């Protein structure tokens, strides 16, 4: 008669690593790394992302006429932009402090577009011939829909003096621009006055832009340039414009209604018709694992990202052969 | 393993012991069979479960990458940004892999130790009333019916009675 | 007869955590995390901090007339500034490269104010009517005490050409400024000359500022702006001014006598009448613990900061019930 | 614990043993009492003391946050700065908590081991001149007066003499 | 050490045992000598070798500093850059020192454990056919010639035969 | 008769540290930290570094006449620059976005110099009297060899209008500059025209520089300043210059033939006549150790840098005395 002490064994082929030994077969183990995603861009907790498709943040915000899809976008959860969107600045140029603005958007979930300087109200200037072949719409020359490219009327560009008071409650994103022409002849041809400027002032802003003549390679058929600028007008504050020519005046500015957690995600993927609690640029994640290895840039309630191929914890004991 | 029991003096495990991590096997004239030691098993389950939750929880706070964009003449800070984000990933990847390796080793040894301690618990009861065979088993001097066997598993084995 | 082997027990209720078990009672333990502070701002090793009270670094350095307390400050150990000091730029504007200057101060323990261009010495210009209602002193209009706001004399602002040679041994912080007026009428009213400039040069500096007209919201009763600039004049180097108008000339500059470990600490707290070896924005620390959890931004000989609520090491053994 | 002694085959500690971490209790016709084993106690004190100083010292070099200010159009680098400073706090917070958990576990086991080893030291002297009761105690075959007891604690227990 | 064998009940090592980490020494009428236990030695060599390679490999991915230059009015980001690069060095320096301390401790205990387990392996064969002297040695009741000694090292010691 | 179980001992005095005990003698151990270097700068895998000696990257690239050694440099593995090279900007001034350019060089192994605007081709201007005593060559006044300092001819500086098309395949680094003179008299003396400018344009660049008059301390005998600028002209793109005076025109630009891993290493050391797989600013490294403590800034196939004085792993066991 005998009694023996012993331990469990089973048919398990799960393996774990230790410092001194790799691939130890164990009776029980627990994977803690999520390796799979659904390969799609999805709603984050039911709230759809802004998928800019072939438009950039600049195209969207300035109102590139190929970006009419985004003429009034509802609240978003995050934003998706391709690596090199084709519909950016249709008329070539720059967007001043562009990255700093994009950073500002990462804390914004909703814009509400409003008209601050009506197009009709420019009676002393021509406000309806501010178009170009670089920004086409349905076969015809058009322009950034949110700013108005003003030119001389009956051979006269009189001084502009406009002011807008932010009487609404929500911070206001105001965009405007300057036109840099090719030569002295083009300047007088559009604006008459040979030496011009745009002065912009707010509570804090103290700007004065002057156009800049230089001979430039053509880009989308134009050698002239537009340089766009922006500010955030606080509530009860007033923005003040004064110009001589070359002014791209605001028509519409964006009201900042909802501030919160957001992100600009860079991805080529389209909308997946889809819902998740954790999104990545490669696809959405649904798991209870404490870790994953899909992509570092996630949004939502996510496992922690690690660069591992494999994380498996021993729970049971060394399994016998 | 460090404690010499698992895959040591106890050569291999028991496919036949299904309801616990550690226990006993008996052989006498009435038959034979396996019985899980509930106490030491449950102790093991609590320990490993606390370990896993401790591990998950400690990794709770940990670096999260954010998108930041830079222009063509901001290459230095762009590169700083990249090295920063990558550096923290490398630090946390290392933490996670090393923790798993180290604790897996400790988990295997924990089990080994639990087995060695159950074996000793039985050894210290039986004293000189059984032969220590060298393989996990004790061969009794007296006959040990099922009630006898049960008292060994009880902690109750009445040594003076035999 | 018997001999037994055993271990210590006692009345301890100290507890420690392990990976596999929490709240294990032990016979002896050692707390290593400091959780308490005295709630005060104190001298650091006997050397008092500069408590700017309701003034900012700009107010202090430019000599905002509400900041006369700091007209000549002795050596400091660290500096304390509120989150939003009320006595900043009394006349509205900007301070150029302000943050880069504040960073410079973190390596400075002592300034010694000296006069470089006497107020009396401006004989061709009016140098005593450079005041405003935005910078009041004892009921009367005043101005930043360290720079001189020069205006036209007998309807004439002749060209200024001044030079100061840094013949003292210690690097010199020189501050100056430009005035941006509201309109063409205000320009000639103060400075006569309609198109003006300030040119500043040193061994390395090559500046030329031009005033900037724009219509601006009022801030502290003014729509005009001041923009302040600075440099560090090395020893044996000369600073050279030339202006037409709009020049806010230096009177006093600061000598950098002591360079060392310092910090600008952001806190609402006042002076505690107090001494410590380790200071935080919430209070001072006195302990031998290797760690604390009070605040990450400390100055002095400090424990290492961690975000833990509790760090306790087992020294003794598992205590029996 | 891993070594089976503390709160294992030795059920509980001794409120009555006041001058060391580990030692002996004796019972004979002359009386009874506790005696600390100085050597194994002092060994434990040196180990734990070195551990604590090692732990404190390793954390000596460690990240220190510095104040850096940024203007309204330097949000990207401000945010980089914040993520950097926070990230290092998270890394060092994790290091400190994990070290304390891991070493606390090791400290408890160290003690367990010191007890098991003192028990074995005594067991290996007494050999078959005493009954191993199973609870930390050895019951002698001969009478063992105070001088006898002292020789067990000495390391000097003359086995052939009994 | 935790397992009580090395510099414990086995007082010291053997300058005379040259071809392994652990083994046996025998004494009988035919002579005496040392013999390495190949199996437990090789096990130790595999473990320590895997440890070192694991340690080297885990440190493979690790922060690399890059040169970045800044002008006189970029002091804030220059300082950020410096604190970043230094901070990661401190984190990896700490990782490397702590790993080496911790694993060195584990390596010493691993050996201790391998010795304790070889001693027990022999003890469990000999059972009551030898006196356990208390110092690593077993003194036989029967004469044990070289073939006898070899069977103890074999794992083959025929207990019923003696 | 007896059999004993025991363990190895030997004559080793190697020691290791553990948490609980320091200086434990062990039978075997393995050092894993490389502490030695050869104290030299060496070829990296047979490919020599560019050792700028007493020249800076600016001196080199602008062609400071004391830096003729580097007039056509072959492919390099890394670059070595002293902390304060003496042959920098011989004519005083600044180099715009200098650090951003140096960063660009860290990804460049080879430049190929080519002529884009021949010196001879300036027939309407004087192109051979653009020299100064600040940039001497063999006793005589010279100038940055890669850019041409153009001055008036027969008292006439007519407008310059030049264009270069990047028809080669490799990105082109184009350098140019502006001259800032001392006073109105010097301006007309060199360039005739009192108010001048340089306009530069490419596909993306839209620059217009104006010279800046100010009274400046002398530096290397000059109070006038040069400010140098650069761009990367893509392939098929054109650069366009227009100026009135003060223009430092490109003669030579650098073709970017090889992009790859490189670094600018700061060191006082000269060439060692030497080859390594891992280089540091203090010397080269040859070891199989996984770690070293020489210097953090390395190039090549290197061990990982740690700040330790000592890393030694136990392999064997506690050695007996
Ligand atoms: C408001 C206005 O002036 N619109 C013009 C525009 C501007 O004058 C010009 O862009 C300023 O730089 O120019 C447009 O013509 C330029 C255009 O002419 C075509 O014939 C040619 O094919 C193109 O390459 C280009 O030169 C324009 O389309 O932008 C006309 C527009 O009405
Ligand atoms: C040196 C000087 O000119 N001081 C004037 C000052 C400047 O002319 C002006 O600030 C430049 O922009 O203007 C002061 O008057 C402006 C002031 O007038 C009050 O009547 C009114 O209540 C205020 O809102 C404001 O417009 C000034 O106080 O700043 C007078 C000062 O002497
Ligand atoms: C192209 C040209 O004009 N070269 C001049 C040069 C420039 O006019 C000047 O640098 C622009 O600021 O000036 C040179 O003379 C200046 C020089 O004169 C010496 O007599 C004196 O010793 C020096 O301190 C300095 O003032 C020059 O050498 O730079 C002559 C050069 O031909
Ligand atoms: C362990 O298993 C993996 C995956 O099955 C295999 O690729 C690997 O080579 C094994 N590793 C070792 C060290 O044997
Ligand atoms: C804007 O208008 C509101 C009331 O309509 C006023 O209170 C505010 O002060 C105005 N803006 C200014 C003063 O800049
Ligand atoms: C341990 O003790 C703390 C503080 O007394 C208590 O709040 C906590 O819930 C306990 N934790 C566990 C796991 O029992
Ligand atoms: C300033 O004066 C000193 C002597 O008074 C002189 O040596 C120095 O060169 C002067 N400053 C210059 C040249 O800029
Ligand atoms: C260990 O040895 C080193 C180097 O020989 C010596 O300097 C040091 O003081 C010793 N450390 C301790 C704790 O004894
Ligand atoms: C440069 O020339 C090439 C052909 O010689 C041409 O294709 C290219 O478009 C030119 N540059 C321009 C248009 O800027
Ligand atoms: C265990 O078993 C014995 C014998 O079967 C029985 O008499 C006794 O009551 C039991 N004791 C316990 C603690 O279960
Ligand atoms: C220990 O005790 C014995 C018996 O009391 C005594 O004779 C002997 O001298 C002592 N030996 C040591 C090493 O203390
Ligand atoms: C070991 O040794 C014994 C006695 O010398 C011998 O007869 C037997 O064949 C051997 N067995 C093994 C497994 O080596």
From TrEMBL, chains B, D, E:
The residues forming a coiled coil are: 56-90
Q: In the UniProt record, which residues carry a glycan?
A: 154
Which cysteine-cysteine pairs are annotated as disulfide bonds in the entry? 144-148
| Locations listed in the record | Host apical cell membrane; Virion membrane
Q: What does the record note on quaternary structure? A: Homotrimer of disulfide-linked HA1-HA2.
This molecule's function is given as:
Binds to sialic acid-containing receptors on the cell surface, bringing about the attachment of the virus particle to the cell. This attachment induces virion internalization of about two third of the virus particles through clathrin-dependent endocytosis and about one third through a clathrin- and caveolin-independent pathway. Plays a major role in the determination of host range restriction and virulence. Class I viral fusion protein.
The entry sums up its family as follows: Belongs to the influenza viruses hemagglutinin family.
> What name does UniProt use for this protein?
Hemagglutinin
- Source species, please? Influenza A virus
Lineage, top ranks? Viruses, Riboviria, Orthornavirae, Negarnaviricota, Polyploviricotina
The encoding gene: HA
């Amino acid at each position: 008669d005998q009694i023996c002490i012993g331990y469990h064994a089973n048919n398990s082929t799960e393996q774990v690593d230790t410092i001194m030994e790799k691939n130890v077969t164990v009776t029980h183990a627990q994977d803690i790394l999520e390796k799979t995603h659904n390969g799609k861009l999805c709603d984050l907790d039911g709230v759809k992302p802004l998928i800019l498709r072939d438009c950039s943040v600049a195209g969207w915000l300035l109102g590139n006429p190929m970006c009419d899809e985004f003429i009034n976008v509802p609240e978003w959860s995050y934003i998706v932009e391709k690596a090199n969107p084709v519909n950016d600045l249709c008329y070539p140029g720059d967007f001043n402090d562009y990255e700093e603005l994009k950073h500002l958007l990462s804390r914004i979930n909703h814009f509400e577009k409003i008209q601050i300087i009506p197009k009709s109200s420019w009676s002393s200037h021509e406000a309806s011939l501010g178009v170009s072949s670089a920004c086409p719409y349905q076969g015809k020359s058009s322009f950034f829909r949110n700013v108005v490219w003003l030119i001389k009327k009956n051979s006269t560009y009189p001084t502009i003096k406009r002011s807008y008071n932010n009487t609404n409650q929500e911070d206001l994103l105001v965009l405007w621009g300057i036109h840099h022409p090719n030569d002295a002849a083009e300047q007088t041809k559009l604006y008459q006055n040979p030496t011009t400027y745009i002065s912009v002032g707010t509570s804090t802003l103290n700007q004065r832009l002057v156009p800049r003549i230089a001979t430039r390679s053509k880009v989308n058929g134009q050698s002239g340039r537009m340089e766009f600028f922006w500010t955030i007008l606080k509530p009860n504050d007033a923005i003040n414009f004064e110009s001589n020519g070359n002014f791209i005046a605001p028509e519409y500015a964006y009201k900042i209604v909802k501030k919160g957690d957001s992100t600009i995600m860079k991805s080529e993927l389209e909308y997946g018709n889809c819902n998740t609690k954790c999104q990545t640029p490669m696809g959405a994640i649904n798991s209870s694992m404490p870790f994953h290895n899909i992509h570092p840039l996630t949004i939502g309630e996510c496992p922690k990202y690690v660069k591992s191929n494999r994380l498996v914890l021993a729970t049971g004991l060394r399994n016998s052969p | 393993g460090l404690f010499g029991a698992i895959a040591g003096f106890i050569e291999g495990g028991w496919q036949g012991m299904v309801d616990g991590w550690y226990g006993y096997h008996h052989s006498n004239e009435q038959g034979s069979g396996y019985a899980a030691d509930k106490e030491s098993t449950q102790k093991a389950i609590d320990g490993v479960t606390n370990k896993v939750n401790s591990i998950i929880d400690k990794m709770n706070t940990q670096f999260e990458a954010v998108g930041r964009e830079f222009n063509n003449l901001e290459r230095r800070i762009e590169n700083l940004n990249k090295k920063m984000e990558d550096g923290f990933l490398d630090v946390w990847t290392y933490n996670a892999e090393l923790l798993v390796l180290m604790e897996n080793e400790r988990t295997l040894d924990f089990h080994d130790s639990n087995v060695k301690n159950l074996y000793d618990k039985v050894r210290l009861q039986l004293r000189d009333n059984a032969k220590e065979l060298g393989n996990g088993c004790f061969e009794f001097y007296h006959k040990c019916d099922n009630e006898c066997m049960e008292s060994v598993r009880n902690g109750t084995y009445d040594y003076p009675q035999y």
